[PDB]
Design a protein around this ligand. Sequence first.
Ligand SMILES: *[C@@H]1O[C@H](CO)[C@@H](O[C@@H]2O[C@H](CO)[C@@H](O[C@@H]3O[C@H](CO)[C@@H](O)[C@H](O)[C@@H]3O)[C@H](O)[C@H]2NC(C)=O)[C@H](O)[C@H]1NC(C)=O
Ligand SMILES: *[C@@H]1O[C@H](CO)[C@@H](O[C@@H]2O[C@H](CO)[C@@H](O[C@H]3O[C@H](CO)[C@@H](O)[C@H](O)[C@@H]3O)[C@H](O)[C@H]2NC(C)=O)[C@H](O)[C@H]1NC(C)=O
Ligand SMILES: *[C@@H]1O[C@H](CO)[C@@H](O[C@@H]2O[C@H](CO)[C@@H](O)[C@H](O)[C@H]2NC(C)=O)[C@H](O)[C@H]1NC(C)=O
Ligand SMILES: CS(=O)(=O)Nc1ccc([N+](=O)[O-])cc1Oc1ccccc1
Ligand SMILES: [Fe+3]
Ligand SMILES: [Zn+2]
Ligand SMILES: [Zn+2]
Length: 341
Amino acid sequence: YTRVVWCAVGPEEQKKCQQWSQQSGQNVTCATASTTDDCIVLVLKGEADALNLDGGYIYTAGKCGLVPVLAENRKSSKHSSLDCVLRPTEGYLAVAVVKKANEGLTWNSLKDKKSCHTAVDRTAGWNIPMGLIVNQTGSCAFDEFFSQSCAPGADPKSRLCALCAGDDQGLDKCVPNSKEKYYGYTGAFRCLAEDVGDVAFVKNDTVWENTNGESTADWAKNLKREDFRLLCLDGTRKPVTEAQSCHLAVAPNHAVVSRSDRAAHVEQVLLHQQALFGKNGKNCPDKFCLFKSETKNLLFNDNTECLAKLGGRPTYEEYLGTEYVTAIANLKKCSLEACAF
Ligand SMILES: *[C@@H]1O[C@H](CO)[C@@H](O[C@@H]2O[C@H](CO)[C@@H](O[C@@H]3O[C@H](CO)[C@@H](O)[C@H](O)[C@@H]3O)[C@H](O)[C@H]2NC(C)=O)[C@H](O)[C@H]1NC(C)=O
Ligand SMILES: *[C@@H]1O[C@H](CO)[C@@H](O[C@@H]2O[C@H](CO)[C@@H](O[C@H]3O[C@H](CO)[C@@H](O)[C@H](O)[C@@H]3O)[C@H](O)[C@H]2NC(C)=O)[C@H](O)[C@H]1NC(C)=O
Ligand SMILES: *[C@@H]1O[C@H](CO)[C@@H](O[C@@H]2O[C@H](CO)[C@@H](O)[C@H](O)[C@H]2NC(C)=O)[C@H](O)[C@H]1NC(C)=O
Ligand SMILES: CS(=O)(=O)Nc1ccc([N+](=O)[O-])cc1Oc1ccccc1
Ligand SMILES: [Fe+3]
Ligand SMILES: [Zn+2]
Ligand SMILES: [Zn+2]
């Protein structure tokens, strides 16, 4: 039992983290970086212990020796009697969404359109969609497929950032952190919702969580589920109720990572931390809820029921799965063995 230093990405995550530190009796304390990549580095240097990551980053960090410790787990149906922490992870659905009013727009007519990506290097926002697109066009010029986009992490003065709005002052345009208006699952969807982009690459849950009154956010309060459509790969368009049969791929859940030599300790702390601030924790909603940040998915996705033990003591390659790891590899060829830092 020593303190665990969590790594927060951006001003908003550091704010939520300090609260968490406050309530934990400093059993958990924070470190901050303007980028996920930066936070990965802090964890290598040993200046930070852990952070929750998207599959795409789990792959970057894995190459540098970091290891998955616990994964996020949401509501399910299968394995009913099984507890949340012991229940296997179901993965999530990567989808392409568009406005229903935008008739005629299909998977086959995306070229030269305007896109909304969660952030460069992420599973549903970048890797899956651009990987399919490169494949399909047999070209690495994915920087010229769309006319304009908002893909946080790309060159600020390039097309891939043309649609990004930066923060409330216009500062930090395209930064890969919640300070970018159109960053992440929620940002990318708002990007489509305000008709800045023609399509948004997010996960199916994002569409449900921000429509039909589920989100009290000004931009989403009058958003209606029937006004959106999913682009399937067979060229069709289906209601967002057919996600199970109209997705680009199923992605591995976001997971908490740490250096291998710190994984056991980080694991210990977090199980006890969610026992206090988890879904039905002792001090939630009473004092602090670890999985609530208000439709902003800070540190953890707001739809996380609990952090689950992995089991099978998976290497980062086995956690992400073999089909996904190859997808990432082939895409990386465009822009084999070596830590990127
Ligand atoms: C797409 O995402 C949406 C939401 O992220 C998912 O839909 C949801 O379906 C689940 C389970 O089928 C519902 O969760 C339920 O909780 C209730 C508690 O009252 C419980 O009775 C059930 O056992 C269930 O776990 C949930 O209400 C519903 N979400 C919303 C916001 O309507 C869906 O799983 C995803 N679909 C695909 C194909 O990925
Ligand atoms: C884009 O097209 C890519 C090439 O066709 C494709 O990459 C391939 O990924 C699959 C599955 O991960 C691999 O195919 C393999 O077939 C069976 C089933 O997975 C394996 O047991 C075999 O060993 C074999 O590897 C390919 O290895 C891989 N292609 C290359 C060049 O290595 C991507 O999956 C496609 N991208 C998307 C998003 O679908
Ligand atoms: C801070 O961490 C410590 C270690 O988990 C917690 O103190 C423990 O309290 C439990 C409850 O009975 C005991 O089982 C342990 O023996 C205690 N640890 C020791 C030996 O110091 C404490 O609960 C944590 N505080 C918060 C708010 O998270
Ligand atoms: C068993 S593992 O280490 O968790 N990797 C893995 C996980 C999931 C899937 N899949 O297709 O859903 C596929 C996976 O790997 C392979 C895919 C195609 C052929 C052989 C292995
Ligand atoms: Fe993701
Ligand atoms: Zn599928
Ligand atoms: Zn194994």
